[PDB]
């Protein structure tokens, strides 16, 4: 049932990526604005079984999408999420800026930001913590290096094709 | 991820070259990545010497006269540059890179540039 | 098999200022170039990819298109750190790949 997944109303944010648990239709549509696979190739999936296939689901800015990619940097991939060097399934993602995009923004999707260690293949961090700070303990935000941990993007009707909301899903492979 | 060189400095007029490149917070054993090697004469453009990818397979640069190699070492996570009979137009800075290899929609097998690079070594023939 | 030219060979201008770089090739190529910076005694990085894909990270000054046998790299305003050599390359699956002969920026 992927019509649950590529078809839904309600995202999430990226530092709170959504799991679910389970292809001619996927590999003939002309809609997706970007569709790379690691490990396999798109045209042979009909002829493999496996026991696990699960669906990743957010939200991230256009000009990020390089970072979903094994081997990659930056905040998304640091802080947000993460990929094995030796991932093994397909990356979709297509443009979403008729949806998702308010007269003077939305700041409803976050991201995280400040993190003091990177994360490890496929976890995700969602609670909201005490402030990341230096050697001295921090309840508010005075401390001059005292900063909230979570930041909010500014997805607006008009903006750069750069920074447009893009919806992306992962799809991983395990036998 | 970091990678790190090893080698000499000072060389013969005539002997083997000797080049190591290695990472550090990954490893090697991956099929979804290769490796080159480039140099760049003093004051000039750059090169490009060849690829390996996994499984061993090469492919080298026919405007050299195949005088060089690349090659793993499994037992320690490795690749090196083997260059014998070095001579005088041999001096020069020595890159090691690496890149992503990935499929299409449409089946077909694509790559990507370079993304990673090394910090050179430098060579110098003596006599 | 295939190659390249370059052109100019040099080039001034001034901060602020606009620069155009053509890299042409002998053959058509399927939109498979790319382009890199290079700072004095320093490894190089890139900028471009596919003739027209931004790399992330690099500023949005930059910026290229063409395809077949003509490229071009353009920069819409100058800043001071934008004064360096570049090169561009091509990895098409058919021939060895090769680089540019290189292009220098300075003050005027």
């Known amino acids: 049932p992927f019509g649950e997944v590529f078809n839904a109303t309600r995202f999430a944010s990226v530092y709170a990526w959504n799991r679910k648990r389970i292809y001619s239709v996927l590999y003939n549509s002309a809609s997706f604005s970007t569709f790379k696979c690691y490990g396999v190739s798109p045209t042979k999936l009909n002829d493999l079984c496996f026991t696990n296939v699960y669906a990743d689901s957010f939200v991230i800015r256009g000009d990020e999408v390089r970072q979903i990619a094994p081997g990659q940097t930056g905040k998304i991939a640091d802080y947000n999420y993460k990929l094995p060097d030796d991932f093994t399934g397909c990356v979709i993602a297509w443009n979403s800026n008729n949806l998702d995009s308010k007269v003077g923004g939305n700041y409803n999707y976050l991201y995280r930001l400040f993190r003091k260690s990177n994360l490890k293949p496929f976890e995700r961090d969602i609670s909201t913590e005490i402030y990341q700070a230096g050697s001295t303990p921090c309840n508010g935000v005075e401390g001059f290096n005292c900063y909230f941990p979570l930041q909010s993007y500014g997805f607006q009707p008009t903006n750069g094709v750069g920074y447009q909301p893009y919806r992306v899903v992962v799809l991983s492979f395990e036998l | 991820v970091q990678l790190q060189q090893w080698g000499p400095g000072l060389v013969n007029p005539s002997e083997t070259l000797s080049l190591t490149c290695s990472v550090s917070?990954?490893?090697?054993?991956?099929?979804?990545?290769?490796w080159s090697w480039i140099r760049q004469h003093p004051g000039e453009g750059l090169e490009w010497i060849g690829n390996?990818?996994?499984?061993?397979?090469?492919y080298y640069n026919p405007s050299l006269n195949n005088r060089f190699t690349i090659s793993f070492d499994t037992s320690k996570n490795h690749l090196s540059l083997k260059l014998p009979s070095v001579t005088a137009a041999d001096t020069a800075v020595y890159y090691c890179?690496?890149?992503?290899?990935?499929?299409?929609?449409?089946?077909?097998?694509?790559?990507?540039?370079?993304?990673?690079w090394g910090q050179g070594t430098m060579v110098i023939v003596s006599s | 098999d295939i190659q390249m030219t370059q052109s100019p060979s040099t080039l001034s201008a001034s901060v602020g200022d606009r620069v155009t770089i053509t890299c042409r090739a002998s053959?058509?190529?399927?939109?498979?170039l790319a382009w890199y910076q290079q700072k004095p005694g320093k490894a190089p990085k890139l900028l471009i990819y596919?003739?027209?894909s931004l790399e992330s990270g690099v500023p949005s000054r930059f910026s290229g298109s063409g395809s077949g046998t003509e490229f071009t790299l353009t920069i819409s305003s100058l800043q001071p750190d934008d004064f360096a050599t570049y090169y561009c390359?091509?990895?098409?699956?058919?021939?060895?790949?090769?680089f540019g002969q290189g292009t220098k920026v300075e003050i005027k």
């Open positions: 390996i990818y996994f499984s061993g397979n090469t």
């Open positions: 596919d003739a027209s």
């Open positions: 053959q058509s190529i399927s939109s498979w």
């Open positions: 390359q091509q990895y098409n699956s058919y021939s060895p790949w090769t």
């Open positions: 890179a690496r890149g992503t290899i990935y499929f299409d929609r449409s089946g077909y097998r694509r790559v990507d540039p370079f993304h990673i």
């Open positions: 917070g990954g490893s090697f054993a991956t099929e979804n990545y290769y």
